[PDB]
Design goal:
The chain is 22% helix and 36% strand. By secondary structure, the protein is an alpha+beta fold. Strands 4-1-6-5 form a 4-stranded mixed sheet. The protein starts with 5 loop residues before the first strand and ends with a helix. Bound molecules: nickel (II) ion (NI) (5 copies). It is classed as hydrolase.
Length: 144
């Protein structure tokens, strides 16, 4: 069914090294990203952020007593041409809200939506992703 054009982004990084967890998409294997996901009907952006973090990298933020920071930033961007097919007819814009998740250390990731994961220094991660909003969020909330 159609993806929804309201989404979240969670920049996951490790507090000690400042390396950024990057995940390799399966629909576009050249697309490495932080965690993104559609906000579903009747759920809030923070709810979606926590749900997608649990789904995509098997990190439970409530149980692990971690802190999902609302970055208080929302941007809108054009859906990539070759991925637009997954949205309702005529949907071309996506509105995305930003979140931060600092883990104490780099760790092993069990992932489900992706092909592979890498821990990268924040400029490398920012330079790797194809999404300008993901790049901006790493620059603004990891690098400072
Ligand atoms: Ni996702
Ligand atoms: Ni999803
Ligand atoms: Ni997902
Ligand atoms: Ni999904
Ligand atoms: Ni420790």
């Amino acid at each position: 069914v159609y993806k929804r054009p309201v989404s979240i982004l969670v920049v996951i990084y490790a507090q000690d090294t400042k390396r950024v967890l990057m995940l390799q998409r399966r629909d576009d294997p050249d697309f490495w990203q932080s965690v993104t996901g559609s906000v579903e009907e009747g759920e809030t952006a923070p709810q979606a952020a926590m749900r997608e973090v649990k789904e995509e990298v098997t990190i439970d933020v409530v149980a692990e007593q971690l802190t999902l920071i609302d970055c208080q930033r929302t941007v809108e961007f054009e859906i990539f041409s070759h991925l637009r097919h997954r949205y309702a007819p005529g949907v071309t814009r996506n509105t995305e809200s930003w979140f931060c998740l600092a883990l104490p250390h780099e760790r092993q990731i069990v992932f489900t939506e992706h092909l592979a994961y890498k821990w990268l220094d924040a400029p490398a991660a920012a330079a790797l992703t194809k999404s300008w909003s993901n790049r901006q969020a790493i620059e603004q909330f990891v690098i400072n």
